[PDB]
Structure formats: C-alpha cells, structure tokens
Symmetry: C2
C-alpha cells in the first residue's frame, strides 16, 4: 500500500499537485490521491 502511494506523497510536497495530478501521474484513485492533498496543511486551508 505504501509502496507506490508513498512516492506520490513526495510529489505533492514538491509541487502541491492536486488529486487528479497525483492519480493521473501515478495511478492511485482520486481518494488515495486526495489523502495526500488533505494531509497538506498549506492546501488544507482555503
């Protein structure tokens, strides 16, 4: 689970990539990707 999903977490931390970006770039569903963005504080706050 944290094999291919982890690398995606590092991608957001470098370019604040959105869910579609993480999912479309790596392949993880829109939910697993949103978890990365949801974890991001700078992105969490609107």
């Amino acid at each position: 689970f944290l094999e291919k999903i982890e690398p995606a977490q590092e991608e957001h931390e470098k370019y604040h990539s959105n869910v579609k970006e993480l999912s479309h770039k790596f392949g993880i569903p829109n939910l697993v990707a949103r978890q990365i963005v949801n974890s991001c504080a700078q992105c969490q706050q609107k």
Copy 2:
C-alpha cells in the same frame, strides 16, 4: 481499490468495527481501515 475495501465499509456499518478489526479481519492497512471509522459519524464524535 474499492474491491476488497468496500466489503470492509459494510462491516463497520454493522458492528462499528475499529481499524484493527477491519484491518485484522479483512487485511487492509490501519490507514485504509481508519478511513472507514473516520467516515462513521457516530464514531467520529467522541
């Protein structure tokens, strides 16, 4: 992703199974399981 994880979502809705239960019962990591409990409103509020 929603193949084996889905069935687990229904398990919590029938016995409010904790993360360890969902993960230990089905096999999903502690995170994917916590997502089920986290979604539960009755369990969300402490």
